[PDB]
Design a protein that fits this description.
The PDB classes it as isomerase. The entry lists the keywords Sugar isomerase domain, arabinose-5-phosphate isomerase, API, isomerase. The assembly is tetrameric. E. coli CFT073 c3406. Chains A, B, C, D are Isomerase. The structure is a homotetramer. Chain A is an alpha/beta fold. Chain A has one domain (about 1-188): Rossmann fold (3-Layer(aba) Sandwich), CATH 3.40.50. In chain A, about 60% of the residues are buried. Chain A has helices spanning about 5-25, 30-40, 50-65, 75-80, 105, 110-115, 130-135, 155-175, 180-185, and strands spanning about 45-50, 70-75, 95, 120-125, 135-140. The first copy, chain A, has a five-stranded parallel beta sheet. Chains in contact: A-B, A-C, A-D, B-C, B-D, C-D. At the A-B interface, helix 1, helix 2, helix 3 and helix 8 of A face helix 1, helix 2, helix 3 and helix 8 of B.
């Protein structure tokens, strides 16, 4: 493939990700106002749980939340059922990330988290998913297709969740009057 | 803040990220053809090195490369200088991610990596940065501003690097004729 | 080297680690009673901070604490100064692990943690170290030599810290009357 | 509990870990000579796979191997079946760590790894375990009991695996004539 065609191939995949993000910005985002309220009410930490590519995005979001004034950390969904559920305490709010909302590792956390009683938020592509139905607050972040020809590799979905989560973090930060000095305290 | 204003605030941050991605898709991406060639020539693993938010994106990109047929793994930039440079062997190609190209932890890897002799690629916002000048192939991914009012929190920059890296992965994958069956082997 | 000599070489390194652990069990452990008291008083999470090999042991200890009824999580020492200090909130107690007590990344956390006001505990080989002197409670875990001929590779030191930390976790667990049913809740 | 009794309680758990290590040093370690030979023959990377507490020890061992001259990295057992199996290439040797040798996440890697053809080594408590029987080389590291009263928390088992793995790393390092200068290259 010549250089101009290689460049056009790269831009094609980028453009597929851009379109997925546009789709979300153009949607009503009705449950987001409730999402902000629940997160503002959190007296503990916002605990993000995920596995696979969603799990790496969940790690970035926990870091971004914390660095911008919303105490947060990540628990890997497998490690959760090997003891790390002990990291979650009564005042913590839990955000579980799964694009399908069927990921077996994430569903496996739910019987314990129901017993523990924490408020559960899901980020998935469908309010009808198993995970979304089991949570207290389902946030639907629809994603039509992944960027590859067979639609198999998380690319549109992981990017959309990252953009949505970053914006939620920055809104919480602005609303709580987080300052340059507070940013400097955590990033010296 | 009422519900419609909270929603508009969230969409504002999302839109700032969208614009940064658009800026990159609209640019020439001249060095990308060379980037693809170097990565296709790799007989070892593509080793991604980063710290902070770039480092979490570098972890996602290594996973995406591997899952789509380009053997790759992540080495945290601090851990690298505590021994993990031993993970990098002669045939490995190294991609070092730093938005400023001045991150002290990333620069600290360079005297050893020069002695080790591996081909070094940087992803930074400026060909003039310290990191870009020390690498064999500098890839410039400019980012005008972060999405927050003070421009302090990686949001536009981490998202742009993610989109660019995903597209590079998917192009390498398509070019090497990676199949549904190969995807299934690594994702059973 | 023949098989019997290879086996004796492996046992030699194992034996060097065993001796370092014995040295600690034979010591007074005077400050451990105070350590238990501080950890029992924690109303938040026990936050472990480390980098390099100490950092991986710190990750294991945070998991072991949590799985046995003491809410705890790990913050990497570099990531801490890139924003993750925002994970630590007023009621959290911090354990910083550094064998020398001079590790630059760990010392770099201290000006912010002093401003944030949390009670700081160090695990180091010397009460005279920079880290130990800056903390509220210094726990000295002396280690004479690493297991390799040049004494360079953390082996005796990382193992000793692991054994000491596991025992502290299991004592807190027994003292708080942690049950089989609670273990099952976090490990379903 | 008074101070002298708290100290004796801590030393009791430490002593339980010490005894488990002694049990192993006193055993024949027959398959270790073969283990060294296979690891010396590796032309690629030694890839450690684990989850839970074994997985954190597997992360420490990969780092220790690399820092002492045996290129190695860690792949989490869950992430492996979400794509990270793509990190393992034909010349890589795989060490899978599971104390029971029945851990579901670790067994789930095996159909793909059999198709991929890599030489598989297991570290488990029993040659009869599912994992041990599926591997090319089973290394049995027996552990009678964990250190807690109910024998539930990995403590003796994770410590024994750490000591055994450190010694294997240091033996490979000595045998290949790894130097102070090479240590300094990876740890500058």
């Amino acid at each position: 493939m010549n250089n101009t065609d290689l460049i056009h191939l790269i831009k094609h995949f980028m453009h597929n990700e851009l379109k997925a993000v546009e789709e979300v910005i153009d949607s009503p985002l009705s449950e987001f106002a409730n999402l902000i309220k629940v997160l503002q009410s959190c007296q503990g930490k916002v605990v993000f749980i995920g596995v696979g590519k969603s799990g790496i995005i969940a790690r970035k979001l926990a870091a971004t939340f914390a660095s911008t004034g919303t105490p947060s950390f990540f628990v890997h969904g497998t490690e959760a059922v090997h003891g790390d559920l002990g990291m979650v305490a009564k005042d913590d709010v839990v955000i579980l990330i799964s694009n399908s909302g069927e990921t077996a590792e994430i569903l496996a956390t739910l019987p314990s988290l129901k017993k523990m009683g924490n408020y559960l938020i899901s980020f998935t592509r469908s309010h009808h998913s198993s995970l979304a139905i089991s949570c207290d607050l389902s946030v639907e972040i629809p994603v039509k297709s992944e960027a590859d020809n067979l639609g198999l590799a998380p690319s549109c979905s992981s990017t959309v969740v990252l953009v949505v989560g970053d914006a939620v973090a920055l809104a919480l930060s602005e609303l709580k009057k987080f300052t340059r000095a507070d940013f400097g305290l955590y990033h010296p």
